[PDB]
Write an enzyme that holds these catalytic residues in place. Structure first.
Site, PDB file in Angstrom:
ATOM      1  N   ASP A  13       0.820  -1.202   0.000  1.00 40.61           N
ATOM      2  CA  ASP A  13       0.000   0.000   0.000  1.00 40.61           C
ATOM      3  C   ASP A  13       0.860   1.262   0.000  1.00 40.61           C
ATOM      4  O   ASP A  13       2.003   1.236   0.472  1.00 40.61           O
ATOM      5  CB  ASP A  13      -0.886  -0.025   1.236  1.00 40.61           C
ATOM      6  CG  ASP A  13      -1.839   1.158   1.313  1.00 40.61           C
ATOM      7  OD1 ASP A  13      -2.100   1.802   0.255  1.00 40.61           O
ATOM      8  OD2 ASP A  13      -2.347   1.426   2.443  1.00 40.61           O
ATOM      9  N   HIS A  30       2.471   3.527 -10.110  1.00 46.47           N
ATOM     10  CA  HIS A  30       2.337   2.150 -10.521  1.00 46.47           C
ATOM     11  C   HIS A  30       3.657   1.653 -11.081  1.00 46.47           C
ATOM     12  O   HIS A  30       4.041   0.532 -10.824  1.00 46.47           O
ATOM     13  CB  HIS A  30       1.220   2.002 -11.550  1.00 46.47           C
ATOM     14  CG  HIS A  30      -0.149   2.095 -10.956  1.00 46.47           C
ATOM     15  ND1 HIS A  30      -1.289   2.242 -11.719  1.00 46.47           N
ATOM     16  CD2 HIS A  30      -0.560   2.092  -9.664  1.00 46.47           C
ATOM     17  CE1 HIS A  30      -2.343   2.324 -10.923  1.00 46.47           C
ATOM     18  NE2 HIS A  30      -1.929   2.237  -9.670  1.00 46.47           N
ATOM     19  N   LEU A 115      11.232 -19.808  -5.478  1.00 50.83           N
ATOM     20  CA  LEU A 115      10.197 -19.162  -4.705  1.00 50.83           C
ATOM     21  C   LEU A 115       8.773 -19.440  -5.197  1.00 50.83           C
ATOM     22  O   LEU A 115       8.498 -19.363  -6.391  1.00 50.83           O
ATOM     23  CB  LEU A 115      10.463 -17.643  -4.730  1.00 50.83           C
ATOM     24  CG  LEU A 115       9.393 -16.749  -4.070  1.00 50.83           C
ATOM     25  CD1 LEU A 115       9.650 -16.786  -2.570  1.00 50.83           C
ATOM     26  CD2 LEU A 115       9.459 -15.307  -4.627  1.00 50.83           C
TER      27      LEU A 115
HETATM   28  O1  LIG Z   1      -0.839   1.554  -3.526  1.00 51.43           O
HETATM   29  P1  LIG Z   1      -2.187   2.270  -4.044  1.00 51.43           P
HETATM   30  O2  LIG Z   1      -3.368   1.987  -3.196  1.00 51.43           O
HETATM   31  O3  LIG Z   1      -1.874   3.851  -4.082  1.00 51.43           O
HETATM   32  C1  LIG Z   1      -2.435   1.746  -5.819  1.00 51.43           C
HETATM   33  O4  LIG Z   1      -1.308   2.039  -6.649  1.00 51.43           O
HETATM   34  C2  LIG Z   1      -2.732   0.250  -5.933  1.00 51.43           C
HETATM   35  C3  LIG Z   1      -1.478  -0.616  -5.780  1.00 51.43           C
HETATM   36  C4  LIG Z   1      -1.125  -1.105  -4.527  1.00 51.43           C
HETATM   37  C5  LIG Z   1      -0.070  -2.003  -4.400  1.00 51.43           C
HETATM   38  C6  LIG Z   1       0.636  -2.416  -5.525  1.00 51.43           C
HETATM   39  C7  LIG Z   1       0.286  -1.927  -6.779  1.00 51.43           C
HETATM   40  C8  LIG Z   1       0.927  -2.438  -7.903  1.00 51.43           C
HETATM   41  C9  LIG Z   1       1.339  -3.765  -7.901  1.00 51.43           C
HETATM   42  C10 LIG Z   1       1.924  -4.324  -9.031  1.00 51.43           C
HETATM   43  C11 LIG Z   1       2.102  -3.558 -10.178  1.00 51.43           C
HETATM   44  C12 LIG Z   1       2.665  -4.138 -11.311  1.00 51.43           C
HETATM   45  C13 LIG Z   1       3.432  -5.294 -11.190  1.00 51.43           C
HETATM   46  C14 LIG Z   1       3.988  -5.891 -12.317  1.00 51.43           C
HETATM   47  C15 LIG Z   1       3.772  -5.332 -13.572  1.00 51.43           C
HETATM   48  C16 LIG Z   1       3.003  -4.181 -13.699  1.00 51.43           C
HETATM   49  C17 LIG Z   1       2.452  -3.585 -12.569  1.00 51.43           C
HETATM   50  C18 LIG Z   1       1.697  -2.225 -10.176  1.00 51.43           C
HETATM   51  C19 LIG Z   1       1.112  -1.665  -9.044  1.00 51.43           C
HETATM   52  C20 LIG Z   1      -0.766  -1.024  -6.901  1.00 51.43           C
HETATM   53  P2  LIG Z   1      -3.888   2.706  -6.480  1.00 51.43           P
HETATM   54  O5  LIG Z   1      -4.118   2.144  -7.972  1.00 51.43           O
HETATM   55  O6  LIG Z   1      -5.071   2.550  -5.603  1.00 51.43           O
HETATM   56  O7  LIG Z   1      -3.398   4.236  -6.596  1.00 51.43           O
HETATM   57  O1  LIG Z   2      -6.022   3.152 -16.030  1.00 49.16           O
HETATM   58  P1  LIG Z   2      -4.506   3.349 -16.539  1.00 49.16           P
HETATM   59  O2  LIG Z   2      -4.289   2.819 -17.904  1.00 49.16           O
HETATM   60  O3  LIG Z   2      -4.200   4.927 -16.442  1.00 49.16           O
HETATM   61  C1  LIG Z   2      -3.389   2.543 -15.281  1.00 49.16           C
HETATM   62  O4  LIG Z   2      -4.001   2.689 -13.996  1.00 49.16           O
HETATM   63  C2  LIG Z   2      -3.245   1.055 -15.617  1.00 49.16           C
HETATM   64  C3  LIG Z   2      -2.591   0.244 -14.495  1.00 49.16           C
HETATM   65  C4  LIG Z   2      -1.241  -0.090 -14.564  1.00 49.16           C
HETATM   66  C5  LIG Z   2      -0.650  -0.828 -13.544  1.00 49.16           C
HETATM   67  C6  LIG Z   2      -1.407  -1.239 -12.454  1.00 49.16           C
HETATM   68  C7  LIG Z   2      -2.757  -0.912 -12.385  1.00 49.16           C
HETATM   69  C8  LIG Z   2      -3.517  -1.323 -11.295  1.00 49.16           C
HETATM   70  C9  LIG Z   2      -2.895  -1.818 -10.155  1.00 49.16           C
HETATM   71  C10 LIG Z   2      -3.657  -2.270  -9.083  1.00 49.16           C
HETATM   72  C11 LIG Z   2      -5.046  -2.226  -9.151  1.00 49.16           C
HETATM   73  C12 LIG Z   2      -5.811  -2.641  -8.067  1.00 49.16           C
HETATM   74  C13 LIG Z   2      -5.211  -3.305  -7.004  1.00 49.16           C
HETATM   75  C14 LIG Z   2      -5.976  -3.710  -5.914  1.00 49.16           C
HETATM   76  C15 LIG Z   2      -7.341  -3.447  -5.892  1.00 49.16           C
HETATM   77  C16 LIG Z   2      -7.944  -2.785  -6.955  1.00 49.16           C
HETATM   78  C17 LIG Z   2      -7.178  -2.382  -8.043  1.00 49.16           C
HETATM   79  C18 LIG Z   2      -5.669  -1.730 -10.292  1.00 49.16           C
HETATM   80  C19 LIG Z   2      -4.906  -1.279 -11.362  1.00 49.16           C
HETATM   81  C20 LIG Z   2      -3.346  -0.173 -13.404  1.00 49.16           C
HETATM   82  P2  LIG Z   2      -1.733   3.403 -15.286  1.00 49.16           P
HETATM   83  O5  LIG Z   2      -0.791   2.611 -14.250  1.00 49.16           O
HETATM   84  O6  LIG Z   2      -1.127   3.501 -16.633  1.00 49.16           O
HETATM   85  O7  LIG Z   2      -1.999   4.852 -14.637  1.00 49.16           O
END
Ligand SMILES: O=P(O)(O)C(O)(Cc1cccc(-c2ccc(-c3ccccc3)cc2)c1)P(=O)(O)O
Ligand SMILES: O=P(O)(O)C(O)(Cc1cccc(-c2ccc(-c3ccccc3)cc2)c1)P(=O)(O)O
Lengths: 218, 214
Positions: A13, A30, A115
């Protein structure tokens, strides 16, 4: 290994807060969050941890598509890293392409000896207990199971990750002190470790800190 | 607003040893801390306080009931014991049943004492009940959901647990409440149970309050 830790669960988080502090958009957070996931996974593999379960906490049906879809390019790299992949959560509502892809990926890495990486997608701790319960209800309706024969150990066989070492440590980054319906049954005896570090900044040294905390805590 | 606090009371023996006294001494101080905590919760409009003692006692349990039940009733406190009491001796079981019956209509604080309780056991007792309804035929395996299961786990009739406090230094739930703490704030303090007082309790409530905001 020395730290005595076989299975670590992380509630990731803070990516958004992290970005906002930098004056950047969620996309940046992200990119940074994925980079932190890659670093935490290698750290775990290089440190003898048997299993790593990751839960992304969000600050819906489609989102959990993107999320798991992105993880697709990652599968090859993971395989090449001798990581065994598993998706835990309610993917029963995911189109059957994903479910096949998902099972291909699980099939593919199934025999790797490194892992075991479990990724939560549409996962809920209560849901998890419920699907295991439904499975026991089926055996009841079949006249094979008598309600009174149902005990902890039996239900324990039907919850996610029963075949892996029990969760020893749950880390939650981002400052919040709640489980937020991530693992529930599985954390009955786990050490709980809360840190204010935001996921993007959580590194090898932060992970080492949590393991040593667990090592000395036990 | 914090409505239901659950506390894992740990540290009595370790505390006793720090004073150079025997285990029984820690117990004594342990029970005074319970009295103080319960007064404090009632004193501040908390709807429910759930206490778990983390580690003969059957007779003393009879005595705590026979001796304190009267005051709790006078304080408009509703008492419930949670956990597996099916194997305690029948006299204690009877005492528990009467104490509960006596205070059931109270409207002040509901004080839940977990005795021989485990979070997994609790979920399993609910599962067994649902299995009975399936065996009979009035329940289809796939009609079982979160809400339904929630209706068969301890305390389903009370406000959801908002804050779990564990004193004594360990950072574990130790198979205390599990289903019930899905969204609860978790507060850990190194303060030993005998020393846990009003100030420590408010500190945790403040943490809940401040955090609930941010
Ligand atoms: O940490 P947050 O609550 O600010 C949020 O980034 C959601 C989030 C939480 C934990 C991890 C990630 C996350 C996990 C994994 C990846 C990921 C992993 C591998 C390849 C592409 C993207 C991208 C982002 C996203 P949110 O989309 O709600 O702004
Ligand atoms: O809607 P987009 O195309 O703007 C985008 O959110 C796409 C994306 C990229 C990497 C991770 C994620 C993502 C990460 C994690 C989650 C998420 C995690 C936990 C619960 C709900 C949603 C949703 C989406 C989304 P970006 O990372 O390019 O801003």
């Amino acid at each position: 290994p020395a730290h005595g830790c076989r299975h670590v669960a992380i509630i990731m988080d803070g990516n958004g807060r992290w970005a906002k502090k930098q004056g950047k958009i969620r996309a940046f957070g992200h990119k940074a969050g994925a980079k932190s996931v890659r670093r935490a996974v290698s750290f775990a593999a290089n440190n003898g941890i048997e299993a790593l379960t990751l839960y992304a906490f969000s600050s819906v049906s489609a989102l959990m598509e993107l999320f798991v879809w992105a993880l697709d390019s990652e599968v090859k790299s993971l395989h090449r890293h001798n990581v065994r992949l598993r998706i835990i959560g309610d993917t029963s509502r995911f189109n059957s392409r994903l479910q096949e892809r998902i099972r291909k990926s699980e099939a593919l890495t199934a025999g790797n000896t490194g892992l075991t990486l479990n990724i939560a997608a549409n996962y809920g701790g209560r849901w998890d207990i419920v699907q295991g319960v439904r499975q026991l209800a089926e055996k009841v309706q079949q006249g094979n199971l008598q309600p009174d024969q149902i005990d902890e150990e039996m239900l324990n066989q039907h919850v996610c990750m029963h075949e892996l070492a029990p969760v020893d440590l749950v880390i939650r980054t981002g400052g919040e002190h709640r489980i937020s319906n991530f693992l529930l049954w599985q954390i009955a005896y786990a050490e709980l470790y809360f840190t204010d570090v935001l996921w993007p900044d959580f590194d090898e040294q932060d992970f080492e800190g949590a393991l040593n905390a667990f090592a000395n805590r036990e």
